[PDB]
Structure 1
Amino acid sequence: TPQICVVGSGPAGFYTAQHLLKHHSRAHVDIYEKQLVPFGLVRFGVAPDHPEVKNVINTFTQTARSDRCAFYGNVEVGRDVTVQELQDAYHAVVLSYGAEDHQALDIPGEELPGVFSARAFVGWYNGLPENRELAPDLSCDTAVILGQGNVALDVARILLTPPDHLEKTDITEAALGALRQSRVKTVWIVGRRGPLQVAFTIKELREMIQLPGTRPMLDPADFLGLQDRIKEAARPRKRLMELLLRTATEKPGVEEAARRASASRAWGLRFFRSPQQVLPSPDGRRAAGIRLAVTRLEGIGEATRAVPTGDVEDLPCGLVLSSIGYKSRPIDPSVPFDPKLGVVPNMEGRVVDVPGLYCSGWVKRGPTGVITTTMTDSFLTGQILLQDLKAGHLPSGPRPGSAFIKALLDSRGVWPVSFSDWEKLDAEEVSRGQASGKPREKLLDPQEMLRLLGH
């Protein structure tokens, strides 16, 4: 009876577990999670207006309800239980704990009230307990987001959607309340490079262009000569660039021109600008602008980089969201960690020089794929692990699994959240959603969550 444990209950943990249970009829999989609840970024990252994307929870739930899978929330691996303890109890351990850090801007002014990582702002409207008191000040009229990735688009879309259109989503009631009072009418999404280097994808770009109550602000000068350079581009890329190009250069029909003229909000893309400094209000109590270094591109293809021209531009704004990526964080002394790539060093999921220890998802590859990328990547890890298990490369003999770990946790005063505990809070969140017409109303207070969890 093979005992495997998974550290992290987001898409990598669940798809790794799912692959292991499907391809090995005896193996048992225990999934550990630091938060009180499961699902990682499916619950706390994916936007409330992308409910479609969260449907993978239904298959995670079937896996968690099966006889050979168990969930242990409220357990911080590296703190409540060490990786070495897990290695001693299981035949194999998979690190699937994501990239829990935001990359900082590393610029002056970054400490002013009104500056946040997009991550934190997302965690706030998605009910991540640690961001429940973020209390972003939306009394300003312009927000600036740095980074032109899908995350940037999510934050801009939430800031500009007519609040009534988010009423029936699972957005927190607190964030929706704040959004109803927001004075933000303009959002600029600023990239260091040009149009050809944007990192967002077409579904999200179209959602922005078509967002009711808004008009797009693209400078055609940013796109001169684009059709020409995208003629040998890959189909998806080319389609995206053509959608951007049209939005920037086609004069709209009479109806769309009217709709754009009556719009109360606007969003735009700014290119060739890198963040140099957040500017304070005269009294230093808030952000009042962002100083951007003008840049120009040098290099060919993917090797192209922005290099400063020496010119600067100041752009007034009261909200600055850095949406420039992530880094995983080390978890425990027994786990190698590369501070540079911000990943656990590994060879196709096998952690370097640590027999029995594997990894999957963002902590394995770096923070850049969508859920399906994470899924097929977790499957690759799952294949190598199971081939190692079958081959007899992991310790021979019994391995106690949770029997041993719970006894440690029992003594240490740590009471894990089982999946059935979670099911109780899920029912409560869902029922609370019934009265208000939402999918659920997430509990944010850890104390109240613990009570509703049966703790």
Structure 2
Amino acid sequence: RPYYIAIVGSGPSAFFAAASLLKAADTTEDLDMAVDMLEMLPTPWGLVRSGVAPDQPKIKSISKQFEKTAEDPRFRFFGNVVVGEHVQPGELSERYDAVIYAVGAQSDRMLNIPGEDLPGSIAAVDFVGWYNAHPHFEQVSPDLSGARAVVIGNGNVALDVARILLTDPDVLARTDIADHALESLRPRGIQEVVIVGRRGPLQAAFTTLELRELADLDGVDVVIDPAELDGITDEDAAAVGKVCKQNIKVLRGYADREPRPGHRRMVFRFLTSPIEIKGKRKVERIVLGRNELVSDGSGRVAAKDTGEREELPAQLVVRSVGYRGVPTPGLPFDDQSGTIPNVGGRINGSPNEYVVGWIKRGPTGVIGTNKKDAQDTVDTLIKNLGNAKEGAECKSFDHADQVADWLAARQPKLVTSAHWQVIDAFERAAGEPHGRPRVKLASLAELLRIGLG
């Protein structure tokens, strides 16, 4: 019989794992694989679909690789299956030789400041999900009519949020952005976005191309007070690394240009932390505080509050201070890191359950970083199966049909590969008349109406 492997989640780490498993079978005598992928949403691809910005179709095109993997007769997809709800980890570990958890980071890190949950104060997780038509975020529906938005954080997601708020909606109309978001963005309500970083430019988590692309926003002025960069030398930057030296150059380039009255603006503020979000019933203003950089002995510089304060009117606050993993019922979890504890990708205390991607490593790295991660986990998984075989300890298992029928019993509204293909064709066809790659079905009800029709 082949080995039966379940993968939970369908993002990059899941697909890289699936490819690794099938390639091992393809290159190894007396080794065969069957892969079942269980996904919470009706649609695959995880953040490649729901995270990467709608103005980034080329980077999204890694999806072609995932499609090639899914063409394999040994591969099956079951969407609209929530592990922890419809089926439990213990049930999966008994019906499969091994199970790989590739669930990513489904929630947000909080600021832990007063006023944070006022209407108008949201996470990038919610805002990105909403603009990319993730069905769990359809009702986020932020008011985008106010003149100023504030984005907290200095990572690349912070730039995505700023860029989408200020991009010419005519440009966005040619993308797979959610129709509901395009509608809210069309009136161009936001006149200024302020990106607020707690440490300095040298500590920014941004990468260079992502900073450079802000120049392509037609008519939008990128504003940086030259005082944010004064005293930072080429030597200081080079001492952090190559990426930082390039970043600093690009930031100086923005600082060197005076903004134009009446133009939309993206403003970078460094050494600044949000202190308190204020308003009667919704966000009206934010209190910002100034930090200084201080060594804490860890080999990092820390931001330390100086006490200095200013208040800035604002109508939207988006915290882009990191995604965060969510515990899965039946599996161990590290609350502080939002990861599943593991040894070499094998789940703590488990002989046959594994982790890959952001649930294993934390929310760091580009899509490509998940490839070696998945390979390493898969190598270990296969080693462990082999050790069980040479010791004659492999499980005894029409098992493929039995499992598929059981999944259907637990979730009658599951979405097979075939039914995903229906959604996919529909969404792409919807984009044709107006020259968009696709128009997404933005709620579970709509996805299932098409998928399960």
Structure 2 length-normalised TM: 0.94
1:304 is aligned to: 301
Per the TM alignment, residue 413 of structure 1 is displaced from its structure 2 partner at its CA by 4.7
Contact 2:86 2:411 in 1 (8 A): no
Distance 1:348 1:413, change over 3 A: closer
The Cα offsets for residues 276-306 of structure 1, whole Å up to 9 and x where unpaired, read as 11010xxx13211111222111017851111
3-state secondary structure, aligned to 1:181: coil
Per the TM alignment, residue 409 of structure 1 is displaced from its structure 2 partner at its CA by 2.9
Per the TM alignment, residue 262 of structure 1 is displaced from its structure 2 partner at its CA by 6.9
1:337 alignment partner, one of 333, 337, 346:
333
1:354 aligns with 2:355: no
2:438 is aligned to: 440
2:312 alignment partner, one of 309, 312, 315:
315
1:224 aligns with 2:230: yes
1:7 is aligned to: 8
Q: Distance in 2 between matches of 1:401 and 1:90?
A: 10
Q: What amino acid maps onto 2:79 in structure 1?
A: G
Contact 1:80 1:414 in 2 (8 A): no
3-state secondary structure, aligned to 2:83: coil
Alignment of 1:15-54 (within 5 A): 15-25=16-26, 26-54=32-60
1:425 is aligned to: 423
Q: What amino acid maps onto 2:341 in structure 1?
A: P
Q: Distance in 1 between matches of 2:106 and 2:447?
A: 21
Q: Distance in 2 between matches of 1:231 and 1:421?
A: 52
Q: What amino acid maps onto 1:162 in structure 2?
A: D
Aligned-residue CA RMSD (Å): 1.8
Per the TM alignment, residue 230 of structure 1 is displaced from its structure 2 partner at its CA by 1.7
Contact 1:152 1:323 in 2 (8 A): yes
1:160 is aligned to: 166
Q: What amino acid maps onto 2:326 in structure 1?
A: R
Distance 1:32 1:401, change over 3 A: farther
Per the TM alignment, residue 406 of structure 1 is displaced from its structure 2 partner at its CA by 2.9
Alignment of 1:250-261 (within 5 A): 250=256, 252=257, 261=260
Per the TM alignment, residue 351 of structure 1 is displaced from its structure 2 partner at its CA by 0.9
2:117 is aligned to: 111
Q: Distance in 2 between matches of 1:82 and 1:324?
A: 31
Q: What amino acid maps onto 2:21 in structure 1?
A: L
Contact 1:127 1:172 in 2 (8 A): yes
Q: Distance in 2 between matches of 1:413 and 1:189?
A: 43
Per the TM alignment, residue 15 of structure 1 is displaced from its structure 2 partner at its CA by 0.7
Unaligned runs of 5+ in 2: 27-31
2:29 is aligned to: none
Per the TM alignment, residue 233 of structure 1 is displaced from its structure 2 partner at its CA by 3.7
Contact 1:3 1:399 in 2 (8 A): no
Per the TM alignment, residue 183 of structure 1 is displaced from its structure 2 partner at its CA by 1.1
Contact 1:110 1:277 in 2 (8 A): yes
Per the TM alignment, residue 94 of structure 1 is displaced from its structure 2 partner at its CA by 0.5
3-state secondary structure, aligned to 1:261: coil
Q: What amino acid maps onto 2:78 in structure 1?
A: Y
Q: Distance in 1 between matches of 2:398 and 2:164?
A: 47
Contact 1:138 1:178 in 2 (8 A): yes
Q: Distance in 1 between matches of 2:307 and 2:208?
A: 33
Q: Distance in 2 between matches of 1:373 and 1:231?
A: 24
Alignment of 1:22-421 (within 5 A): 22-25=23-26, 26-227=32-233, 228-248=235-255, 250=256, 252=257, 261=260, 264-280=263-279, 284-299=280-295, 302-333=299-330, 335-392=331-388, 395-399=393-397, 402-421=400-419
Contact 2:202 2:248 in 1 (8 A): yes
Q: How many residues align?
A: 443
Q: Distance in 2 between matches of 1:263 and 1:169?
A: 27
Q: Distance in 2 between matches of 1:400 and 1:117?
A: 46
The Cα offsets for residues 145-167 of structure 1, whole Å up to 9 and x where unpaired, read as 00111111001000001111112
Q: Distance in 2 between matches of 1:391 and 1:176?
A: 54
Distance 1:399 1:296, change over 3 A: farther
Q: Distance in 2 between matches of 1:194 and 1:30?
A: 46
Q: Distance in 2 between matches of 1:124 and 1:130?
A: 8
Q: Distance in 1 between matches of 2:89 and 2:149?
A: 42
Q: What amino acid maps onto 1:321 in structure 2?
A: V
Per the TM alignment, residue 72 of structure 1 is displaced from its structure 2 partner at its CA by 0.7
Q: What amino acid maps onto 2:93 in structure 1?
A: Q
